[PDB]
Motif scaffolding. Structure first.
Motif, PDB file in Angstrom:
ATOM      1  N   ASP B  59       0.842  -1.187   0.000  1.00  0.00           N
ATOM      2  CA  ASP B  59       0.000   0.000   0.000  1.00  0.00           C
ATOM      3  C   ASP B  59       0.879   1.240   0.000  1.00  0.00           C
ATOM      4  O   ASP B  59       1.550   1.522   0.992  1.00  0.00           O
ATOM      5  CB  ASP B  59      -0.927  -0.007   1.225  1.00  0.00           C
ATOM      6  CG  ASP B  59      -1.855   1.203   1.279  1.00  0.00           C
ATOM      7  OD1 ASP B  59      -2.100   1.703   2.396  1.00  0.00           O
ATOM      8  OD2 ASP B  59      -2.338   1.653   0.217  1.00  0.00           O
ATOM      9  N   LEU B  62       4.137   1.547   1.948  1.00  0.00           N
ATOM     10  CA  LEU B  62       4.088   0.554   3.019  1.00  0.00           C
ATOM     11  C   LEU B  62       3.919  -0.858   2.468  1.00  0.00           C
ATOM     12  O   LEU B  62       2.931  -1.170   1.795  1.00  0.00           O
ATOM     13  CB  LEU B  62       2.947   0.868   4.002  1.00  0.00           C
ATOM     14  CG  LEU B  62       2.521  -0.230   4.989  1.00  0.00           C
ATOM     15  CD1 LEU B  62       3.349  -0.178   6.263  1.00  0.00           C
ATOM     16  CD2 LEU B  62       1.037  -0.139   5.303  1.00  0.00           C
ATOM     17  N   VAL B  63       4.894  -1.704   2.770  1.00  0.00           N
ATOM     18  CA  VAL B  63       4.789  -3.132   2.496  1.00  0.00           C
ATOM     19  C   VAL B  63       4.645  -3.860   3.830  1.00  0.00           C
ATOM     20  O   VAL B  63       5.383  -3.582   4.774  1.00  0.00           O
ATOM     21  CB  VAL B  63       5.972  -3.654   1.622  1.00  0.00           C
ATOM     22  CG1 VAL B  63       7.239  -2.843   1.846  1.00  0.00           C
ATOM     23  CG2 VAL B  63       6.234  -5.142   1.828  1.00  0.00           C
ATOM     24  N   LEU B  64       3.667  -4.758   3.914  1.00  0.00           N
ATOM     25  CA  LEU B  64       3.511  -5.609   5.090  1.00  0.00           C
ATOM     26  C   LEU B  64       3.489  -7.093   4.744  1.00  0.00           C
ATOM     27  O   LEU B  64       2.798  -7.518   3.819  1.00  0.00           O
ATOM     28  CB  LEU B  64       2.258  -5.227   5.890  1.00  0.00           C
ATOM     29  CG  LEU B  64       2.256  -3.867   6.601  1.00  0.00           C
ATOM     30  CD1 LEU B  64       0.912  -3.602   7.245  1.00  0.00           C
ATOM     31  CD2 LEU B  64       3.355  -3.767   7.644  1.00  0.00           C
TER      32      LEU B  64
END
Lengths: 201, 202
Positions: B59, B62-64
């Motif tokens: 996103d 942001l990588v999770l």
């Protein structure tokens, strides 16, 4: 008494986290210390898993796994905040906590069994964090958080791990260590066993 | 650059199905990029540094990774409907139950898909012993649909594919919960074609 019970290790890296968090929250807890030699019958029924420390017991609720405990303590006792507010920053915080336990806490286990590859790997990893601490006084945060409760026990055990920080980046990490260790909450969370790691090694 | 989140999901992956269920429960739309063990894309390779790189949510910047991290992010960023309780004690219990499902049962399901016949029986003995709790509440230790059910729904769906059939007493309550779980429109929408094919061919 009407006070939480904590089954804690005396030198355990993950028990130190919980103890640091409880100190940061300023809450009084009855601490029963547990060894690998003997794990109490009370804890034996409360925790089904081989690794039994840390375990927090409160009224009806029993909790194990250190981050579950740490997040519960942050949700039950909001002051001061040890997590960020907005979900993106909270995601990043949790992810850093995940990667510290996976990549570095695992290395430390090997370093206690005198692995020299793991010792060099942890030193190289720690020194790579230096450009973070030129931006924020704490890990990716202007305020002390739970991510610093992952790093503080680890960086405390650095003489005991045989790790001496030199070269580019050492100045930045050592300053961060000063911000971390000079806290009254950190000093109060130390067992005598944990205090003996620094002044001997 | 694209203004919608990107999920790097597996096609039959257990933890990917969790993330897919939660996104369906939240009702939020996502570009889903399916990945095989044969080949993992250059985009995914840069953002995830681990051998097992699915599920992965991306996103903006942001990588999770880690399913529980992604699932908790989704519940916090998209509050409606809540899949976690409000009070700290209940939240700790939920997280512990979610921890035990992954430590005890999801580990056995890894062994079943390999070879193990003992893991097949151990998972059967595990589920049937937890049968009295389903008499208490319509969902796992909860009056409404939570993330704990998002741990159970990918698991109990693959129960014909694991080779576990509803056996003896207690199985009335299990199957009644399972039919409550699988008949959710969110669950059926979250399923891939591969995951649908496990139901009919076993």
């Amino acid at each position: 008494r009407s006070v939480m019970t904590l089954y804690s290790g005396k030198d355990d890296l993950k028990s130190h986290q919980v103890r640091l968090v409880l100190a940061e929250k300023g809450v009084g807890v009855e601490i029963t210390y547990v060894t690998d030699e003997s794990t109490p019958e009370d804890l034996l029924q409360l925790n089904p898993y081989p690794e039994a420390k840390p375990t927090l017991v409160d009224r009806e609720l029993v909790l194990y796994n250190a981050q579950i405990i740490m997040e519960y303590l942050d949700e039950r006792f909001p002051h001061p905040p040890l997590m960020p507010v907005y979900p993106v920053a909270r995601g990043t915080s949790r992810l850093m906590m995940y990667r510290i336990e996976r990549d570095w806490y695992s290395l430390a286990e090997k370093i206690q069994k005198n692995d020299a590859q793991a010792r060099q790997e942890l030193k190289e990893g720690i020194l790579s964090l230096a450009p973070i601490f030129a931006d924020t006084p704490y890990f990716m945060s202007e305020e002390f958080s739970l991510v610093d409760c992952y790093l503080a026990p680890l960086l405390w055990r650095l003489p005991a791990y045989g790790i001496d920080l030199e070269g580019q980046g050492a100045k930045e990490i050592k300053q961060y260590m000063v911000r971390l260790f000079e806290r009254k909450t950190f000093q109060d969370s130390l067992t005598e066993e944990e205090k003996e790691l620094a002044r001997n090694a």
